[PDB]
Amino acid sequence: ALTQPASVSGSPGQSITISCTASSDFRGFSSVSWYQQVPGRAPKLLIFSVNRRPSGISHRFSGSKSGNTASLTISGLQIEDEADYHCNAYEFFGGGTKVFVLGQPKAAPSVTLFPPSSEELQANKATLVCLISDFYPGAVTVAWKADSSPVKAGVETTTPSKQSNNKYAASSYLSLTPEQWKSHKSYSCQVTHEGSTVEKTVAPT
Amino acid sequence: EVRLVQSGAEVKKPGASVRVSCAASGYTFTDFDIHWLRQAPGRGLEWMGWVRPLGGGVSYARQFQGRVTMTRDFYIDTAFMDFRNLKMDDTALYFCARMGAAREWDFQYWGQGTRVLVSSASTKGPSVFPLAPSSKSTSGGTAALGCLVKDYFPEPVTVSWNSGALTSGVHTFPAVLQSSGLYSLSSVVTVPSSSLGTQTYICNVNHKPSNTKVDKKVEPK
């Protein structure tokens, strides 16, 4: 019964604020806690009673409350602040908020497209593998094309994950029958990132 | 000094059971309840219940009553969460947690998390297909070749090249989850394009859950 924004973006040095709103009927909302969590890892308590912070937590994190709405403010945004943030009051938790820190210059993706191997076609299967890497930020739109027609069915795209060099990578797979692959002139993996597009094409030849 | 250590990841079929332990240390075990929470994929945290080491009292959210049993062994300061008759939507990252000394529902101490995957899929070794290099995968002085590690379950697989002798240029991408419940990933290595006719390239795929190891030679085609 706690509502948080889906995401909040900022650039280093700025101050951002994440809200946590309870229902109108909520009598215990004065003991709000805030947590930082790298996805897949244990949360870390940041603020635990509107504004109290444990020992070892940066003073750049501060909490406040105005009626039914609590707020976590991050002063002097740093790249290390890029994580998920959760609020809770008693057993009730918010949905979580993804925080993005735009701390790198824009970087165009490199796209590599592999056709189905003949060894997979012999098994009467066919997979097109599109690998996207070294782009920043991590918001790409991947679109597949059969000849020039958009393809919706059979596509599976991962969410962009960070690499060692702080840039993102992702992979998109197009599953099709061998007859679908051999009956078209070509297939294309179209990657659009920050208004620019990189397109790779393969043909059953 | 305060530590909460949970047991390892689990993979189950709908209708099976699972026991997750939480070994506590660094404080007096009977002074704090041990809470249990879970995080579904792409979702927030969800409180499940707690167990009281002193006396063994428990409390549960409604949707877990009748399927979740929380206990403790106070001689070894370990709490247990028994989840029976699992459903597919019980797939989550499970946490045990302890409140801070303020005891104001501020979870200052968390276990490292336990992955519980509930899927109707069964263990399956991967099919390894070569991603052969061609003129449409070369970038001047370098060429991209790889291996398609297709339709395995569950995670993970590890991929190396030439028995670990090939390190630079290797990029193993995170796996994708097909709608069939099976996983697939790709592993590509950037190599000098002049070496395509002389150097042998072999990806070594290891899938411990199925006890399967595949060595796939990749050559230009």
Numbering used by the authors:
A (entry chain L): 3 to 9, 11 to 27, 27A, 27B, 28 to 91, 96 to 106, 106A, 107 to 209
B (entry chain H): 1 to 52, 52A, 53 to 82, 82A, 82B, 82C, 83 to 100, 100A, ...
List sentences quoted exactly from the publication behind this structure.
The HIV envelope (Env) glycoprotein trimer mediates viral entry into target host cells and is the only virally encoded surface antigen accessible to the humoral immune system on intact virions. Thus, native flexibly linked (NFL) HIV Env trimers were designed to circumvent the requirement for cleavage by substituting the REKR cleavage site at the C-terminus of gp120 with a longer 2xG4S peptide that covalently links gp120 to gp4120. The CD4bs is a difficult epitope to access as it is surrounded by a glycan fence (including N276 in the CD4bs Ab footprint area) that has to be bypassed or accommodated by an incoming antibody. All VRC01-class HIV antibodies isolated to date against the CD4bs from HIV-naïve31 as well as infected persons are kappa chain antibodies, except for the sub-group of PGV19, PGV19b, PGV20, and PGV20b, which are lambda chain antibodies (all isolated from the same donor).
The unbound PGV19 structure reveals that it is pre-configured for binding to the CD4bs, including the short CDRL3 to accommodate N276. While a 5-residue CDRL3 is conserved for accommodating the N276 glycan in all VRC01-class Abs, both PGV19 and VRC03 show subtle differences in the signature VRC01-class interactions at the CD4bs. PGV19 and VRC03 both have an N58SHC mutation, thus lacking the hydrogen bond formed with the backbone of gp120 R456 by VRC01. PGV19 also lacks the hydrogen bond between CDRH2 W50 and gp120 N280 that exists in the Env complexes with VRC01 and VRC0328, 50. Thus, PGV19 makes multiple stabilizing contacts with its glycoprotein epitope and the surrounding glycan fence in the interprotomer setting of the CD4bs observed on the HIV Env trimer that it lacks on smaller Env immunogens.
